[PDB]
Amino acid sequence: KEIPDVLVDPRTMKRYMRGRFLGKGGFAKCYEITDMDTKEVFAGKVVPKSMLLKPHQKEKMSTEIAIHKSLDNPHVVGFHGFFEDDDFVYVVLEICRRRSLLELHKRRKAVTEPEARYFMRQTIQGVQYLHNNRVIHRDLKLGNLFLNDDMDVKIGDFGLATKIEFDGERKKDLCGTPNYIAPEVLCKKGHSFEVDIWSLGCILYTLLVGKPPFETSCLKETYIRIKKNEYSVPRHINPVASALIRRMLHADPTLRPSVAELLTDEFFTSGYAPMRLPTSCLTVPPR
Template structure:
């Protein structure tokens, strides 16, 4: 399963872009923030009297080359072809020109990045550079640009790489080739093209050939057509499949055994049992029912016709957020739309459902509520409570930093919200100022659950790589696995930013920031109270098991810290405590057309995602 480069965000800043890489796929994506382009890094020249040869051996030169490479990656990320060519041109920069084969986090090169994004001209420029990019360069888990282009369904990049020498038979650390990944993703066009290049059909680490991994009937049939056309016998592994109509059944005996084993290992889910016991019971109608009794139809579906667009609140890679008004009652909502083409094309359906499920099933005063969910031919739609006072990021930008009392109030409400999520086996994993919004009264509420994870346990380590670049926990960067303790670390980072004004380990240089997160001493300003300093330090302990909140008491452990001394938690959750004063956020209304929000409502072919719609949330 290929995971998203970044989750959908309402607001994007250089310090808060999110990335995600789920453990089910083991795909190791580099953090790729959208950063403002750096100025020309070549400002330092050799000292007078020194020779060029001597200068090329100095740390000064190496630092300059490193800056050039960082700038190259930023231009690649922003798909700026002219500047990419400029950075690579030795006629302009001589010995200082950027190296297209320079490796960053997890050994990614510029070509790996361009291949993931599908930037064909950027890929070509990197390959054709004087010191051309290695098309078979490997990441830390042995993936080539071809692997990544395949995983992200970029057929035009796959063709370009192979035409320029990419080896289609190279395997990653799980012995998967590009064809394995095209097959398991169901990308039949890429499968068809790769088969035309006559690849070696070998097994991966699990003993599976590409045809064994076929996701759907179309992909499976592509392999069969290939074998018939060339009279090639496909390798047999004992993994049986049955075609039922146009459906491919995964019916290997091994699959059944694995399912049985998985069920025996899975603990009973209290919430599932509760939901089953509280399900609507069938009640037989009385036999004396009159034949002419009227059948009452349920209320009509909620859909695009019920909302009027007021203004756009935010925009992300996969959709937008709008302020809308429900026509029948003039109630305002935040309407989040995700483009199906992007969601399905990038295998983000699971993430969309995760967010929808959490918003639907969690009822808490400090977590946003989902009111409706529906879909149009082009969009998935979530209608949520509108919080008109903006997010903490907006207010921090205005005020530079908060008083301890103000930070304490928000930290306390966030603590209760995280505790509720953890009780329901949910990790938030993306706590930052932009994901804490203020409602009409000024109370804090968590929003944006695109990177959250359901069904976690204290014993189970999640091995995802996700979060926002200035808010990554040490265990996230180490890829050592994480539990709910990661949310408490992020509360420490957020608390620090609220009272200081910047994240604790922030640096405009990504590599330096990641190094700071893992190694640098945490310097908490002395102007803060001892309780506040200690609160931040205990939350940001690098060892997850020693962190405040890591015990089985979870949020109760955090609530007992002296920083919250004297706070009446019962009054807080019942909203009896007055929120800190804030300056209202003004938004100029701008008419938004229905088609802009929902896409074309009449389509000849519409991709329907079953199980999405929610006519009316019954949460209070």
């Protein structure tokens, strides 16, 4: 099963040139694809049909596509259409040439406070859009906060995302394991929007501290920490930032801030918050 050099779609009839390998993940292998007619560049995911054999698996993908397709926001990875042949399912996405915030984190460790403000602010703006459109991401993590050439955060990977249709709805079934799971999801207690705030709490912690708040070698232990709400923000951290984190990681989902409330927090309003970040931030702190 060799992947074709040119990717044509039966519907829209646009010919995509497959270029440089961008990376892989699970069953999918991503490539830089160029539209041969306009020269517009996209990220094309090529997933073999032998990976989507179960109708159960094809259900998770078709739910994901529907949620992602409907999104249009400068802080969410674009979904520019999907198609297939007799071997592969092709997904055309917005290009993010600067890897994810995870790669930044592993190279940088604890980032400077102004950078956290920048990254979180853009991430929250994206999450607000999702929430306003009744979408819960459910799997927010550093590896899903993509960066483009302009160091702009783009939220992606909606494989665990769900839509709510009525007020006060509480989701119970989750098909898959998130990275920073909220306590209510572990205890099958029923969950809504506030699980995304929890994840963001972990994200901010991780950026500022340099290590995840519930990081352990053992997985079983990690879940205990989450359930018991066992974590400590080092005393070194700004009181204002540590205050925000503690609220964002409240055991009670209803005592966590809402998305709208995050932007107006003292953490974003008091200290220095840059509007742009250089690509140097991938490797070294900004001078």
